[PDB]
Subunit: 316 residues, 4 copies
Amino acid sequence: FDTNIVTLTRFVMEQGRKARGTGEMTQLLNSLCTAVKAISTAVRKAGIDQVKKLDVLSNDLVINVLKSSFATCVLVTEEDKNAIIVEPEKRGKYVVCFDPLDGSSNIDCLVSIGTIFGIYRKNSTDEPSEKDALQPGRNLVAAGYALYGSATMLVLAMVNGVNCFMLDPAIGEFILVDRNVKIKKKGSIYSINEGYAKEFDPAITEYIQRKKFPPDNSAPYGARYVGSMVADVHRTLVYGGIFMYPANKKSPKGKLRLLYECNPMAYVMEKAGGLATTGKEAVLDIVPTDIHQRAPIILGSPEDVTELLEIYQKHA
Amino acid sequence: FDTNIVTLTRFVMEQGRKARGTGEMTQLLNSLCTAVKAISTAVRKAGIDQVKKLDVLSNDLVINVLKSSFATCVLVTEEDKNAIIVEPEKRGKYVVCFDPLDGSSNIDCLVSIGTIFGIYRKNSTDEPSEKDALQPGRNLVAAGYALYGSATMLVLAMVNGVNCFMLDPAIGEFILVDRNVKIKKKGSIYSINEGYAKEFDPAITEYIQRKKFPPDNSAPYGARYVGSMVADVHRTLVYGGIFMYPANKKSPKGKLRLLYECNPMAYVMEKAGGLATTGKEAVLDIVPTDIHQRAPIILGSPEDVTELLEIYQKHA
Amino acid sequence: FDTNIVTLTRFVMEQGRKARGTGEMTQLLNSLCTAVKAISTAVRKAGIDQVKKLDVLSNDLVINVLKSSFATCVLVTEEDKNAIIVEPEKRGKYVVCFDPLDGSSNIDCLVSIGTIFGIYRKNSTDEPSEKDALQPGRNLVAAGYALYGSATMLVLAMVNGVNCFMLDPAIGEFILVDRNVKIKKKGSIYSINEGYAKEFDPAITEYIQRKKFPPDNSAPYGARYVGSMVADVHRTLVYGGIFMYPANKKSPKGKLRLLYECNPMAYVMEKAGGLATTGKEAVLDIVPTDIHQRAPIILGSPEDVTELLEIYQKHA
Amino acid sequence: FDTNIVTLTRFVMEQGRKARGTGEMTQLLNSLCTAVKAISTAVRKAGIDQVKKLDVLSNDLVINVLKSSFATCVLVTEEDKNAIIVEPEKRGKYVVCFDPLDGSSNIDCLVSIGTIFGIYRKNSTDEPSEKDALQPGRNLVAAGYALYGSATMLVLAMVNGVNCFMLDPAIGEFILVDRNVKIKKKGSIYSINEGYAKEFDPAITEYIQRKKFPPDNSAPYGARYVGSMVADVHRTLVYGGIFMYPANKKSPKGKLRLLYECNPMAYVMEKAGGLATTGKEAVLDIVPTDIHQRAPIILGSPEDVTELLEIYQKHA
Ligand SMILES: Nc1ncnc2c1ncn2[C@@H]1O[C@H](COP(=O)(O)O)[C@@H](O)[C@H]1O
Ligand SMILES: Nc1ncnc2c1ncn2[C@@H]1O[C@H](COP(=O)(O)O)[C@@H](O)[C@H]1O
Ligand SMILES: Nc1ncnc2c1ncn2[C@@H]1O[C@H](COP(=O)(O)O)[C@@H](O)[C@H]1O
Ligand SMILES: Nc1ncnc2c1ncn2[C@@H]1O[C@H](COP(=O)(O)O)[C@@H](O)[C@H]1O
Ligand SMILES: O=P(O)(O)OC[C@H]1O[C@](O)(CO)[C@@H](O)[C@@H]1O
Ligand SMILES: O=P(O)(O)OC[C@H]1O[C@](O)(CO)[C@@H](O)[C@@H]1O
Ligand SMILES: O=P(O)(O)OC[C@H]1O[C@](O)(CO)[C@@H](O)[C@@H]1O
Ligand SMILES: O=P(O)(O)OC[C@H]1O[C@](O)(CO)[C@@H](O)[C@@H]1O
Ligand SMILES: [Mg+2]
Ligand SMILES: [Mg+2]
Ligand SMILES: [Mg+2]
Ligand SMILES: [Mg+2]
């Protein structure tokens, strides 16, 4: 008769103790947890406009609560044109890259939406600026996401693993429900917006055909595409398979953004033992040039991402 | 200011007053609302097994709260083999066909799931049995669904229209947010599990390729397929387009069941002003033989459903 | 299993059905329930000024949700100088006298506060005015209160009895927990603000000393006085004893007001089977002259109220 | 658009950093916060028996969640006859003395009830036992209480002050609403169960008379006595005055218990700058002999406790 032993607050504080931290990253991670519970509650009474305004309130809660951690120096949002450089009084050493509410366009239809964040330690000697945001994702300290779906889950990936925490909204505590999550090696679902079929490169084309009409005449792959990144990525982690948003007429730049959509999700993928590629390079090694830079991303189970990379290599 | 101006309790009772009834259907409709609020509650914590534990809880909540309205004589659940005949002391004159929790499968992946219902009046003077449930959905008195997605919505369709109500979980009250919902004439999203492409009839095949490669220089349609009927159908109703679960050889009579999944959603679509076909006949005119009868279903905006029906007819 | 077996929505509508009414009082009684759930919500956060901000919010919620029932023609609030006459487009036939939030004072000290109401039918064919509210509480159609204490309870008394309903805030539903509540004949707790002992008439003085020093070797009565009428009266109803707010020179007509505090609680007490006197006449038989008229009140178990009334009569 | 800057988690972690703690007392204080939110939620749906069973669940949540902190070695509850000595694997260095749910007898009447806790650092070299609980309250590290009233508040008193945190139940976060709370020097309310008037010593008797018929002929003191300790003590802290539960026929032992009712509350009182006396000695200096030992307590504003101590001294 308990609150199932490992709550998020407890877990973060123990992992901060084991790593002999200053308590600055714990304060930061405690602040993202308060922010996500305030966004989950606002998402759930979705109006008692509400896309533009709920995305605005979400932006405002993540920025104000993160400044209050006294742990950040630069903040990058999908919503703000330029980076937020924190006030010298509130400055800590972390750079945080976030999407306060992914899939806002889907709010009206009531589709699962989510918050995506990546945390970097500030590296330079220089007075904080946009430049400190621009590290490859290989340099991420912690990264993860909250999914506001049928229930709200937080997936936190750090250096040592991926852990899933389910909000108990009755007490406002995230409980550890799944630990050291590893993705399947080969799954059975492919996920892409097939309305772009005529824009696709010939490797993506060949692959999709291979999943629908398997040459070895095994069972085809199911298709699922919620059209909300956190939800398609999350389903992939749990059930297995591949998620694709390649280059097509959105240039070989693609739609999703590197710093706050692709990199957090790629870090979660490599940590649960899967892959994240642009088709050419690993997403985590790309050196950013802009904070709102976009990148192709293909991620998911290992044996499904390698099979497509083989087709990519066959078209060279 | 207020809680809302029109609640599902104010609305339901106002309509029973305008309609001049003994208050029995009102009781049934208020019992449905208590049941939805309770399942929403259980769905939003989920785990503080998931799948075949929550849908068992949901079966239980609905059966129990409906017998207590003293308004039902026959209940048909997805979960139960046979039609439940209510004890005479609790019998009323209605037959309710329901899906306790659609897409329960998806609890682990946290995808939008929902509750589906249709209410038929008993009209057959004889001791109530399965018999009374085997009516064409053209005979529905009321139908609708509750969607547990990023927020909870109850959509209810009756004689006079389709109305959408958002749950405010802070006060446990459904508030009318959308009045006399009517679907767009032509949409721009098609929704089908393309992984069955190996098995699709040619009318479905010409349609999808015309959606991906328009003969003229149209923008192709976007594709979305959550894999949960209430979420896909709700997006359709709200934003336009078409949802198809055609006949294919793995489940050659379609997958979805007529009484509790197909008919409520066909009725909601027809009152919103869109179409719902088998491909050969309309879903609402089919007469059941079995309470668990499956049926094919193509539904959505009138112009796009028509455009596929012509292709069905083009194959003769 | 269920949400509950009998909800305040099931009960209210079942009674309107048994009673054979146009469903107008039902609408009013369902509007009261929405209003109580919303104030409970605001009372339980309190501060995320308190006092004259929350009671202003509560005044607002009640007036607004009652006009919207289209069931009220005159409203009397503690908060407003004059009786509010409802616009003809929203007028119905009832007069509601209410205290939006009793004991608002105590929000800072976090003591149990409550909402008090009495409903009178208009019976006076003339354009509605204050006039219609100035009826003896013997004329009440329904009365009761909501108590925001450790849990929320709504107690409603009508013709046929007093029933207690507990709010389940998880589903926003009031569940019948106590049916046909009847008060104990003799209690063992007296409740008065003894700091006015300098000003009390001698009948009150002989009573209290007989409670503290029984002439025989009885156990003396315990004393409790929360200082919030709904909490003191609720304890009385539920556990027995007497609550006294006698006449004294600072407020010589008593403090508590007849229409919205005294009469509802006198009516609840009389249907629970206890007594409610001024000391000289019963509170329910007094005819108002002013909507904000004050009145003395002694109420509780029949044997203890009697025992003080004899001492009043012993002084002649 | 925030979660009003200083949440309890943030405050505790900063104060743990400033004191260069190991993070063991932060883990303990984070665990009492989870426990209090799980008890507040259970208290608020008070049954959807429930006195004996809710006090039992409360006991079980505080013990299981405190063991899980890995910060305690001995636990003393009102509910357990003997002290709980923790398992060597879960052992930390703190002794915690608590009342999991004060005022449970009042649950049926819906009176404010609360949780009271005192934390001691274990002092001996010896294998932990009842003996480590038995320190004077002068040796308390931290002490405080949660009040489940109109809203839920946590009052935390530590070496440097008293801070009041209001639960925002919407997000499950305690927000700092009042800091470095100091009690008034003289208030205007006295609080005692006057049903014991004939059991009272002559100093308590003289005092009460002095408050009701003030010799200097100033204004009498109001009386308030909820009969729930956390609620009478809390009202005293905020509004001022005195709270008394002296010796009478419950011997010069009194009813309230030293380790978990009186000492936490006395520590809060001295820290907000008031007094807590048995009439003879300060409650914080008493050397306990038993864990379930009782003690007289008189606490509140300074100028009111000294005035009574003068009367105590006059009766010698
Ligand atoms: N939960 C955590 N809290 C704080 N630091 C952590 C955590 N997990 C890992 N770390 C390591 O802790 C150092 C950060 O310390 P500081 O920024 O003073 O809190 C880094 O070496 C991160 O790798
Ligand atoms: N909100 C409603 N309440 C009750 N009956 C309704 C409602 N809306 C439509 N009806 C019509 O009311 C009749 C049901 O009355 P009864 O079964 O006595 O409650 C039917 O003719 C339904 O078409
Ligand atoms: N639950 C209830 N709903 C409606 N009216 C009720 C209820 N309980 C008692 N009544 C009686 O119903 C009549 C009110 O009918 P009407 O004003 O058309 O709604 C009155 O005679 C009240 O005494
Ligand atoms: N919030 C707090 N967290 C931990 N220790 C605290 C706190 N506030 C004061 N202390 C001091 O911290 C020491 C406890 O350290 P430790 O038990 O390793 O956590 C003691 O000297 C307490 O006085
Ligand atoms: O380009 P489309 O088909 O409109 O899909 C966009 C959606 O897909 C994603 O890129 C990935 O789910 C979302 O971030 C976005 O809302
Ligand atoms: O995953 P599949 O085989 O495409 O089936 C999807 C269908 O099955 C369900 O998940 C359950 O019937 C529906 O919600 C959905 O339309
Ligand atoms: O504090 P006093 O003067 O005894 O007055 C108490 C009375 O006033 C109120 O707090 C407000 O009318 C009542 O709830 C209560 O019965
Ligand atoms: O002795 P009495 O009058 O029953 O009062 C007991 C109540 O008073 C207190 O001792 C102090 O409020 C409570 O702990 C307890 O429930
Ligand atoms: Mg995005
Ligand atoms: Mg189904
Ligand atoms: Mg009042
Ligand atoms: Mg106690």
